[PDB]
Amino acid sequence: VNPTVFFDIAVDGEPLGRVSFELFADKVPKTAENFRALSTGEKGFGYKGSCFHRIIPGFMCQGGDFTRHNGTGGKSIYGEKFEDENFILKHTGPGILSMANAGPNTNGSQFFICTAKTEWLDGKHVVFGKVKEGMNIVEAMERFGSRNGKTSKKITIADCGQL
């Protein structure tokens, strides 16, 4: 059964709400497992305490850099980066959860949540889940983004785990 994980989001340390994701282990098992384990922190490291560093209204919310906390870092549970598993699933609309990268086969821990359809990313970013509850939390994060993605407040994953 596809696992479910949650983020408790805070804004400048003030609680905002919880968002939960279905991870498509049935179609991308290796990529879902990476996100799952990073959400539980069971490898000794993961998303807890990291921030969404790039939020662009009309497009997406991006985060996941827990190694450098400056938008350039993050790592997977398989080593620093791992290959593109597949591109079966498409960026079909709001709530799609997908891997950020710096070119082919550079998946780490950074991810993004679509707030709209982003079809021009299909085949270049590995889609591996979707928001299951709390899309309105993601929408609420948009109001702290900007045109180039810089945020006006600190949007953190205050807690996370598996449901």
Binding site: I56, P57, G58, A116, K117, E142, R143, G145, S146, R147
Partner: protein
């Protein structure tokens, strides 16, 4: 993809341009006076069933810089022309903003909305009929707002989007 609309909030200093914009974007009222140099905001909204992206330019009303408006007037698609109901001078200044926009854009039908802000205050000095008349000339809508109570905030920006739609 969704359409982008470039909105520009203009008007005299202190009339509430940022108070209205911050209410729209962040849903709270700034009671302190933090005069603007220049700021930009983005919000996706649904107006009449169409999703769209609002790009909002929050401008400075200081008269020292009134000769430096042409560039943002050229680039903007529609203009929220704000005065304050308790400030006669700001209503007077509204005329020059309109004339300056028409001048710069060389058109009588630039998407535009007249906004009478601070409508929650007592001691109004600019009543609705002259604002209504001024709006009847020009040929544009007029909306009374309060950035303190949030009254008319959504209507003001959404009406301006509807004017850009009618034009284009």
């Amino acid at each position: 993809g969704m359409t982008e609309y470039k909105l520009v909030v203009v008007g005299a200093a202190g009339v509430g341009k940022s108070a209205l914009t911050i209410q729209l974007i962040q849903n709270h009222f700034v009671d302190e006076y933090d005069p603007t140099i220049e700021d930009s905001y983005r919000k996706q909204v649904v107006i009449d069933g169409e999703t769209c992206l609002l790009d909002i330019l929050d401008t400075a009303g200081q008269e020292e810089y009134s000769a430096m408006r042409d560039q943002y007037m050229r680039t903007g698609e529609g203009f929220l022309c704000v005065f304050a109901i308790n400030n006669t001078k700001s209503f007077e200044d509204i005329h020059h903003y309109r004339e300056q926009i028409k001048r710069v854009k060389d058109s009588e039908d630039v998407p535009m909305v007249l906004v009478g802000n601070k409508c929650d205050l007592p001691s109004r000095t600019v009543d609705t009929k002259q604002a209504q008349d001024l709006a009847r000339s020009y040929g544009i809508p007029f909306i009374e707002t309060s950035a303190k109570t949030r009254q008319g905030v959504d209507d003001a920006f959404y009406t301006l989007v509807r004017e850009i739609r009618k034009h284009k």
